[PDB]
Every structure is written in structure tokens, then in C-alpha cells.
Design a protein around this nucleic acid. Sequence first.
RNA 1: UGUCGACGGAUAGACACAGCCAUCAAGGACGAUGGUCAGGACAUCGCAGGAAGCGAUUCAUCAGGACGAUGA
Lengths: 59, 59, 59, 59, 59, 59
Amino acid sequence: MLILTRKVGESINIGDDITITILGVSGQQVRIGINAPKDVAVHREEIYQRIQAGLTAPD
Amino acid sequence: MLILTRKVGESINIGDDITITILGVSGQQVRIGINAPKDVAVHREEIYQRIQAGLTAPD
Amino acid sequence: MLILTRKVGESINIGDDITITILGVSGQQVRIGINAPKDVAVHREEIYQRIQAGLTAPD
Amino acid sequence: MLILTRKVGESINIGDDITITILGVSGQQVRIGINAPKDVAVHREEIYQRIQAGLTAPD
Amino acid sequence: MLILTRKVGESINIGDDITITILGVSGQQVRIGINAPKDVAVHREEIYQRIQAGLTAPD
Amino acid sequence: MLILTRKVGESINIGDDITITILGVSGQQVRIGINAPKDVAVHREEIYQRIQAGLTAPD
RNA sequence: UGUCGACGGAUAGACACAGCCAUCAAGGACGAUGGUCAGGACAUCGCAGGAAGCGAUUCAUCAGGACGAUGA
């Protein structure tokens, strides 16, 4: 697992299509923005396990 | 962009190969884990911007 | 919208004929003064809707 | 002058073209929103004095 | 208006004569002790309403 | 002494100028509001003991 | 929560305290390093999506060209 230490306003890049930015912080919560193409899905882990429960359709 | 609040210790997922976890905050700093295969390149923008310039990690 | 912050007792201007004054706060209530010629109307938005209810001809 | 009270988040009007809003308080401050056509000016009293010096926000 | 965060068995002082002690917690109820001179009153807010209404000093 | 068992969000009173409010609990910690004039001092019993060391004034 | 800035046209910003804050790190490791501890303040929390998203009232009513009037 690759650990990185960002600060408010800084960004990560993944592959050649996806970019991530930490838009700010509000105490114990962190406001993160994801900029992936609609060709790939983006979801929280609280919901990803509902997707992979056995619903939605393949590409 | 797709924006979400994550509390420290919560997780986010991208595609079917990538997972992200907020490990915690330290002021206006944010410690983040990235969990993708070595099949994908994963760096902050200041790093990314050399790589696709025509190369890989210097040495 | 153009937002202005104003400490109680300070002033604002509109056009070359109108002055606005914050007079004070009392609770969540805010005493505002509006100084304009009778050439223009001044009203709360809930009263302004009456001024839009007709009045296309004088008496 | 025409004086009236408004609670925070409530609305107001001037003429037949201008809307005014009390956006909230912050201590002794008040956030006041103005919504007029660019056909007319709006500034703070300390700013109005620049425009009345013979200009409108120079180059 | 002060706000303190006090754990069970610890104490706080007011004026030069009044001592407060957090005696402990019982779920949502909190056991509290107050030590004041006979120069002053002390009650819960329910009972306080009897005192300052123009009372405690008869005709 | 005066001893009570107060639920979170309820209030207590001292003299005719002082109000106390239990803001709520967090494990053993208890967040408490104290509302008195600057006519009186208030500190936790730790800090009070530095002041009652025979001075009631720094330095 | 208070204060500041802002000729700004934005339901806007910016600063500051009860845990606060900075630096290194092409690193794939839940990475490394430094220095700092209680105030007169009810400060962190919740919902969700392809959006740099969204919500979070210690006083109140009548009203009018008057820095309006009055009170629980």
C-alpha cells in the first residue's frame, strides 16, 4: 500500500486518467474530490459493498 | 469532479483495482493510503508531471 | 449578488441616489435603514409581491 | 429614510428591478446581499467616495 | 461565557468562594456538587425561577 | 453541600448572576458551560491553586 | 464564535482559540521528521454524488420613507 501525506489543495494522480484533490478538512472529516472518467466507477466503501452485493450490470 | 466527506479511517473505491483510505489528519495535513496494483502508476502531481514527460523513476 | 459585510452603524450606497445603513441587530433580527427618493419604492420581499400584483395603472 | 427589521435569511426589494437580502450576522457584523442590474452601482460608503471621485473601478 | 471539559472527580472554582466538583457520570445523567457561601443562593434552573422573579426579599 | 444529578442540556444556577449548563458527556469527560460576568473570576481548580498561592494577581 | 478585509456584483471571502501546527518523501510502507500544551468561546457533526456538491437560529412582534415603535 502506497501512503502519501497531502495538505489542503494538493493532488494525487492514478494511471493516466484519474486525478484526486483534497479540497479541505473540517475536523475529523476530510473533503476529497475525485476526477475520474465515467468509464470507471467511483464510490465510497460504505456503498461499494452494496454495489457488489449482487446488483448493477456489467460493462 | 465527484466530492465526498470521509471521516478518518473510512475508505473509497475507484474502478475494480483501486482503493483509497484516509488514515488521518495532522492539522492541515492528511495522511492517505493508496491500494492499487503496481499495474497502475500512483504519484502526486509534482511527481506525475515528470513521468509522462518521457521517462520513469530516475534511478 | 454582491455581498458586503457591515458592522452595526456603518453605511452602504446604491446608484447615486440611495444610501443603506445597518442600524443594529437584536436577536436574529436586523434593523436596516433605506434612504432613497420616493421616485423608487422600498419594501420587504413579502410586501414587494403586492407591488407586483397589479398597479399597472394609477388611481 | 425608511427603517425596518428583517430576520437573518429574509428578503427585501428596492424600485422594480433590485432585490436585497440579509444573508446573516457574524458578531457585530451583518452579511448583506445586494442584487441589482449592472445598470446601477453598489458599494460601501468608504468605497463610494472613490467612484464619486470621477471613475468606476479603473484599469 | 466559558466552556470547560472536566472528567469525573475533578473540580472548578468560581469567584473567590464557590467550588464545583464533577462527582461522576450515570449515562446521560451527571452527578454534580456545588459548594458556596451562605452569602449566595444555589439551585437547579427549575427552582431558580422562584428566586430572581422579584422574590427572595418580601415586603 | 449542594448535590445534584443533572441530565445533558439542562442548567443550574448560583447567586443571581451565574448560570451553569451541562453541555454533555464524552466517556469520563464532561463538557460544561459557565456563564458569569467578568466581575467574577473562573478557572478549573488546578489553575485556581496557582492564583490562591497568596497573590490573586500574576507576578 | 468573534474579528478582519473586499470598488467585491460573488447567498461571496480572509483571520484567530478549548489539540495545535510545519517540513521531507517518483514513496507501493497504514513512510519518515520536528516543536508546542486550557479559556471568558456551547466546534465540530450529519446527508449524499460524477457536482472543487449540500445542511447545521441564546429573544421577539407590529409595520413604514421615520436611524420607526413596543414588549413577554
